[PDB]
Every structure is written in C-alpha cells, then in structure tokens.
Amino acid sequence: GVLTESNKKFLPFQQFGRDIADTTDAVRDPQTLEILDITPCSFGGVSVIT
Amino acid sequence: AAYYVGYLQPRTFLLKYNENGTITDAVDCALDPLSETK
Amino acid sequence: CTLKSFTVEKGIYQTSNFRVQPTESIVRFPNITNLCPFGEVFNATRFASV
Amino acid sequence: AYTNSFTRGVYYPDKVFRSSVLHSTQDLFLPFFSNVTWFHNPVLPFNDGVYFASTEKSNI
Numbered sequence: 001g002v003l004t005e006s007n008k009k010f011l012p013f014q015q016f017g018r019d020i021a022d023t024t025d026a027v028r029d030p031q032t033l034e035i036l037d038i039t040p041c042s043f044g045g046v047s048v049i050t
Numbered sequence: 051a052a053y054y055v056g057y058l059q060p061r062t063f064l065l066k067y068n069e070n071g072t073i074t075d076a077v078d079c080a081l082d083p084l085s086e087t088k
Numbered sequence: 089c090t091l092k093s094f095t096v097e098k099g100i101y102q103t104s105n106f107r108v109q110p111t112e113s114i115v116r117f118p119n120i121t122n123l124c125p126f127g128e129v130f131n132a133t134r135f136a137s138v
Numbered sequence: 139a140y141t142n143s144f145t146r147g148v149y150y151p152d153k154v155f156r157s158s159v160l161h162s163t164q165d166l167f168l169p170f171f172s173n174v175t176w177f178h179n180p181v182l183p184f185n186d187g188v189y190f191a192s193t194e195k196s197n198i
C-alpha cells in the first residue's frame with residue numbers, strides 16, 4: 001500500500017487496528033510510536049472514447 | 051483480606067468497542083433466549 | 089483487438105485495466121534487544137579440560 | 139460459600155483496534171451470573187483457566 005502519517009490514537013498495549021470488513025489499515029511502527037495508515041495503490045478501468 | 055476463585059468455559063461472547071478501543075459491554079450467547087437472539 | 093472487426097461504431101468501449109506497480113520494499117522489525125554473552129565465553133580467565 | 143459472579147472477567151481476546159464495532163468472538167471466558175467460592179489456604183484444581191479476584195490492604 002501507501003503508508004502515511006495518521007491522526008488516529010491507539011491504546012498503549014495495542015499493536016495494529018482493523019476495519020469493519022476485517023481489513024488492516026492502521027499499523028503502528030515498531031520502533032517509533034508514530035502511527036501509520038495504509039492506502040491501496042491506485043487502479044481502475046481503461047476506456048476509449050472514439 | 052478476601053479472595054474469590056472461579057473457572058473459565060469456552061462460550062461465545064459478543065463485545066462492544068468504543069471510539070478509543072476499550073471494551074464497554076459484553077453479551078453472552080447461551081445464557082437466556084433473549085441473549086441468544088441478540 | 090477487443091471488438092473482433094476492422095470497423096468500430098461510435099460509442100464507448102472498455103479495453104483493459106490501469107495499475108500502479110510497487111517501487112521498493114521496507115521491512116522494519118522490532119528494535120534490537122538482549123544479546124547473548126558470547127564474549128564472556130571466549131574471553132574467560134581459564135577453560136576446563138576435555 | 140457461593141456468591142453471584144455478576145458480569146466480570148471480560149478480557150481482551152487479541153491485539154486489534156476496532157472503533158464502533160460489535161465484533162463477536164469465541165474464546166474462553168468467565169460465564170455470566172455464575173457461582174464463586176468465597177474464601178478467608180488449600181490447593182485448588184487449575185483445570186483450564188481461573189479468575190482470581192482479591193480485596194486486601196496488607197499485600198499478603
């Protein structure tokens with residue numbers, strides 16, 4: 001994915017968050033206690049206008 | 051001084067998380083039929 | 089090559105998918121910790137017999 | 139010395155952070171509204187798990 005800085009606050013024993021559909025989005029960095037998010041890489045369909 | 055000792059069983063629970071990620075309420079599944087519905 | 093012909097009518101058509109490929113890999117294990125006392129063994133005062 | 143267990147013994151099943159989620163899980167737990175043995179010494183069977191609660195002020 002695409003890691004980025006996050007404004008979410010974890011809990012001091014908690015490792016990594018999840019979502020409603022059981023998908024991982026928030027991963028804590030192991031060394032630094034900064035919080036990182038996950039955004040999937042861009043994709044889509046290609047169409048031809050002719 | 052006083053102390054209480056119980057025991058643990060493998061029964062399905064339902065948990066309710068909050069905005070910060072703290073467990074605030076839990077419901078048993080095999081206690082009474084209303085909780086079975088829940 | 090999608091509509092198997094040489095003439096294409098006016099409209100909109102879907103051909104393929106657009107996708108972004110990853111650039112590199114980053115692995116961050118937990119911080120380092122309790123070492124093994126190997127230097128105690130080799131730099132000892134005296135060694136036992138066989 | 140039987141005492142009602144009320145609703146206690148709830149512990150975090152694993153290490154995941156969910157917000158406003160009603161996720162339900164299957165694991166070992168203390169049953170709701172059970173009987174616990176009030177004590178005031180001997181050996182006890184461990185079995186699978188145990189919910190040990192203590193009220194004291196002398197740390198003994």
Ligand SMILES: *[C@@H]1O[C@H](CO)[C@@H](O[C@@H]2O[C@H](CO)[C@@H](O)[C@H](O)[C@H]2NC(C)=O)[C@H](O)[C@H]1NC(C)=O
Nearest residue numbers: 029030031032033034115116117118119120121
């Ligand atoms: C492993 O842990 C040490 C100590 O927690 C980290 O060292 C700290 O790094 C921060 C980063 O800005 C500094 O502000 C502290 O002053 C450092 N403390 C010490 C005692 O050195 C170290 O960075 C961690 N390892 C990695 C790879 O990040």
Ligand SMILES: *[C@@H]1O[C@H](CO)[C@@H](O)[C@H](O)[C@H]1NC(C)=O
Nearest residue numbers: 009067068069070071072074
């Ligand atoms: C979550 O944490 C914030 C931090 O101050 C606090 O204000 C809020 O009350 C907490 N939420 C609950 C449900 O306690």
Ligand SMILES: *[C@@H]1O[C@H](CO)[C@@H](O)[C@H](O)[C@H]1NC(C)=O
Nearest residue numbers: 125126127128129130131132
């Ligand atoms: C023993 O001590 C010397 C002196 O510093 C050091 O260079 C050497 O690495 C030590 N031996 C081991 C096995 O670490």
Ligand SMILES: *[C@@H]1O[C@H](CO)[C@@H](O)[C@H](O)[C@H]1NC(C)=O
Nearest residue numbers: 140141142170171172173174
């Ligand atoms: C606890 O023990 C009392 C006395 O024996 C009994 O009346 C009660 O039904 C018991 N509770 C449970 C949940 O078994």
